[PDB]
Amino acid sequence: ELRVGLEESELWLRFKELTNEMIVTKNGRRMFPVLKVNVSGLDPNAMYSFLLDFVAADNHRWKYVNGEWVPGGKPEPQAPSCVYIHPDSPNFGAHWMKAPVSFSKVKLTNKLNGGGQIMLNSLHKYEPRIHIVRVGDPQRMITSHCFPETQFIAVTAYQNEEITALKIKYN
Ligand SMILES: CC(=O)Nc1ccc(-c2csc(N)n2)cc1
Numbered sequence: 001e002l003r004v005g006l007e008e009s010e011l012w013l014r015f016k017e018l019t020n021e022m023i024v025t026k027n028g029r030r031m032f033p034v035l036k037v038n039v040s041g042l043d044p045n046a047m048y049s050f051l052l053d054f055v056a057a058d059n060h061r062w063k064y065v066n067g068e069w070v071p072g073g074k075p076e077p078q079a080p081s082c083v084y085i086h087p088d089s090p091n092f093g094a095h096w097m098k099a100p101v102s103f104s105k106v107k108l109t110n111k112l113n114g115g116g117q118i119m120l121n122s123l124h125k126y127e128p129r130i131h132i133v134r135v136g137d138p139q140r141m142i143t144s145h146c147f148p149e150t151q152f153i154a155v156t157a158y159q160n161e162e163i164t165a166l167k168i169k170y171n
C-alpha cells in the first residue's frame with residue numbers, strides 16, 4: 001500500500017504546539033522546518049513527479065493578540081493555485097523510496113516575481129500537501145496527502161517570540 005510518512009514529525013509538532021509561522025518575503029524564503037517525507041508502496045519500476053502545494057485552512061485570517069492567535073477578520077481572495085515541482089521529477093519509484101524526499105528549495109513569497117516561488121497571504125493558515133503524479137499515464141493518476149502536523153500561518157515577520165527562539169534553536 002502507498003504510504004507517505006512525515007519525517008521529523010516530533011520537530012513539526014514542537015512548532016505546531018506554539019502555532020507555527022513561516023516568513024513570506026518579496027524574493028521568497030525557504031521553510032524551516034523543511035518538509036521531508038518517506039515513501040513506500042510506489043511501483044519501483046514506474047516514473048512519478050512529486051508536487052507540493054499549500055491548502056488554505058480557514059474562511060478567515062488570523063491575528064496575534066495578547067500572545068494568542070485569534071480570528072483576525074475576513075480572508076483575502078485565495079492565493080493563486082501555485083504548485084512546486086520537486087526538482088528530482090520525473091523519477092523512478094525506486095528513487096523516491098530509497099531515501100526521504102526533501103522540499104528544501106521551495107520559497108514562500110507575498111509577491112508574484114517568478115522563480116518557482118509559492119505565493120501565500122500573510123496572516124492566513126495553510127496546510128502543506130504533496131501530490132504524486134504517474135508519468136506516461138493516459139488516466140494521469142495522481143495521489144494527494146496533507147500533513148496536519150505541518151500547518152502554519154504565513155507572516156511577514158514572526159509574531160510569537162517563542163517561534164523566533166524555536167527557529168534559532170533547531171535551525
Ligand atoms: C496548479 C494546479 O494545477 N494544481 C493542482 C490541480 C489539481 C490537483 C488535483 C486534481 S485531482 C487531485 N487529487 N489533485 C492538484 C493540484
Ligand SMILES: CC(=O)Nc1ccc(-c2csc(N)n2)cc1
Nearest residue numbers: 049051083085133139140141142
Ligand atoms: C486525474 C487528474 O486530475 N490528474 C492530475 C491533476 C493535476 C496534475 C497537475 C497539477 S499541476 C501539475 N504539474 N500536475 C496532474 C495530474
